Symmetry: D2
């Protein structure tokens, strides 16, 4: 009955109930998966959100910049799921860029220390999570991360575009390592979804040229998309992630699936 019946999947990146990861985790549990959740920094907060999913799931702390957390992680998950059981799926739904790197702030004024921090959390950590978790994954497993098509430059996204270009390259190497375990690694490139991280791109703060540019970009999606795009509904994205976590894309790895209404296939 359930697409992910009987699979065990770690989902990272839940912060609010608008989190792409929250909707992935929801759809996963509806399709019969058993989850382990990771949260960063505001754990009691995340737990209250995570209490609203259709089923219970252990929650564990994971700051991908923290080397001890990364080192304990597989042993912690193993404790959460039972000795002798492994993970079938891993979702990386995580990103960060300091405010200098994005929004109004000129591109050339972002210090390297801030860019470097963004690339660590947004790109490198895809490899670091795979490293920590591949040893406790089953053949036929699936690792999925979240992308925003960075093939072309665009206003405001600035250094996060750079970090996504890195992530895509990183995903291609993760696939070479994951292959040795019989495990696939892919990214889902989503269209714009109203989340907390999307509210932080300007720094919210108001009436600046970059805010207008951002509204114009985001409206372009629904226009260009042959099937339309609803920024208010993360479900089509969540479903696509679940497609990859299942056994129905068994020959796809090192790759990017576009859950964007087909917008990236159309110029106008």
């Amino acid at each position: 009955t359930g697409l992910l019946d009987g699979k065990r999947i770690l989902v990272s990146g839940i912060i609010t109930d608008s989190s792409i990861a929250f909707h992935i985790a929801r759809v996963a549990q509806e399709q019969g998966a058993q989850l382990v959740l990771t949260g960063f920094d505001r754990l009691r907060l995340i737990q209250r959100i995570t209490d609203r999913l259709p089923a219970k799931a252990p929650l564990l702390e994971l700051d991908v910049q923290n080397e001890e957390h990364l080192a304990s992680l597989a042993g912690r998950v193993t404790e959460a799921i039972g000795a002798g059981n492994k993970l079938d799926g891993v979702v990386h739904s995580i990103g960060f860029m300091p405010q200098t790197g994005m929004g109004i702030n000129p591109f050339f004024d972002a210090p390297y220390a801030d860019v470097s921090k963004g690339i660590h959390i947004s790109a490198y950590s895809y490899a670091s999570m795979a490293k920590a978790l591949l040893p406790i994954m089953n053949p036929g497993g699936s690792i999925v991360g979240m992308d925003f098509d960075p093939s072309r430059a665009m206003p405001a996204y600035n250094w996060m575009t750079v970090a996504k270009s890195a992530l895509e390259s990183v995903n291609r190497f993760v696939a070479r390592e994951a292959g040795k375990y019989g495990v696939r690694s892919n990214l889902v490139a989503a269209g714009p979804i109203r989340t907390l991280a999307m509210s932080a791109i300007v720094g919210g703060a108001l009436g600046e040229e970059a805010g207008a540019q951002i509204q114009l970009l985001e409206e372009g999606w629904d226009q260009r998309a042959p099937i339309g795009w609803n920024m208010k509904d993360a479900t089509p994205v969540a479903k696509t992630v679940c497609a990859l976590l299942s056994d129905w894309l068994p020959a796809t790895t090192g790759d990017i699936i576009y859950a964007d209404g087909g917008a990236h296939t159309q110029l106008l």
Copy 2:
């Protein structure tokens, strides 16, 4: 229980039991679809093959070069599935190129009449089938065709590479038309599968440089693919097609999903 439970899907392109389309049709019926089949030219032949699928399905004649067949097609399908019912899925699994266009024959010696015939069957017919069938498709439906990545040139494939480049462009326009109906249009770019059409690329005929080049290309797939590639098993491809026909890639259109072991993501 079934991924395609309760959907009605037309599959074209069955000629033998190695046909990519045969394995799509098989997997579809295992996942609860109800099929309508199309066959070209050797109908009694196709019928004997189609008798070995797990369930029965009406078979109809469709030469995509035949304008009367294309004109009657929707009315014929409607008769096969019941007045008041529509198609949820369409699979285009069809191609052709005259022998001058491919194999040993020099690229520059292919007459336009032969190239033109190949592009008609291999590319144009994706639009012509969509034209004929979109009026009898349901919102939320899916059209899928079969591609072989033509982004780079390669030995022997010659004008069929050209025809696949056309098909990709054609698919992007089909998506704009299909959108009006709430229907997606996508291609699956497969790795090499041993089928009848694959036996015809040299013209089989033997010990020529192009035959060796073709064997070297085909071995490269399994090497470059992080998860490996088995040319003997069309199932992973069939499954991927079924992924697209389902409701689990709801935001993907005008696009290409690579069922090739990840080979196209790796240089070596």
Copy 3:
């Protein structure tokens, strides 16, 4: 002094003085090339235009659909340039699509016969010209054709987009054949230039949705382009073609150079 000093170059595709090919031919002669021109159908017409170039050049008839013209072509050029001399450069600046294939006319209503005619002139003829001319080209030579980026679908361009996707694939195979002669083959993907062929896309005829879509597309170029885009000035395109015809891009073949203000590198 002259970039193309002492080279001999065939330029096709001059119809008016706005023709991309006219500006290629002009810039070529300013940089010291010696030209041979080809014209289709309105030869006395073309000759009057060609009389306004900075220097004289023989003009020859070439309908790329005409097999006798293609067969005589190398012998005709050889007569025009002297026994014992060869071509160093070839410019394909040629395209056509019947009115059903483009503009207002729905995509699905274009008959195959018309599409096929467009692909013959717009794509296939790049191979047919190379075939006819490679035997009379010098090592270190250059073949260049003209593209309009067809990676994504767009309004109105319709089947000509398909024909350009084909051309790109064709160019990649032409490069494999041309390599044997020490000759490169490339396309220049230009931004929109006001030419005769651009006036014919709607069929000119007025106030239809597709006309507006076309004006919106064309304005997007200058906005997205970091250095701007002037649709009134073919010179930057002509210069780029001359770059490829010279000895300064000696390691580039099977490829596409974008003379579009950088518009294709920017989403918004």
Copy 4:
């Protein structure tokens, strides 16, 4: 007579006489440019090499990790070329990755601190140099950096592939900033050239699987390239860079020109 007659161009990245930058600087001076050179760390060393170029040129110290050097740089160049003169060209020919990030060392064992250092020097510094130099560039100027196509993963190149993916994204944003000054920004993606940095990829050290993989990759270039590829001759690459620095690619920005024999256009 000279392609770059009367232009003033800064070239970074000369370390030995095999340096891609050395051959760019040579070809530039043959075509009449006047140069300013930058060197990192071994200045007396670089100076002896730079003494063998056809003409003299001031040399200045530039570690792109050093913020004071970056801050003084424009004022230093201005002193070297004369108050009231500006730069017409900038060449970034610079990269670095610590040994953990590349060669034999497993991909997952590269610490972030080392990756981060590589991305700082190899990618970020393209923006930092543009920042420092755009204020002293002339309209119609050109910034060029050096790439190695990272679209697909490959053995050994590991984190430097990631850094090149970043660089490509960075170049697209640099083009948006450079546009405001009438200046283009592009990368040249070169085929493999025997340089010092190429000797350091394994760490030279011997008979390991990755060494063989690297030799197999490098031989693939000359095979796949329609015009061949000579790893011993940086001139075709140098010429391509000079093409971009000239006025003959005036409409190309945010982009990548492939000086790789056409290898990236061919699968086999």
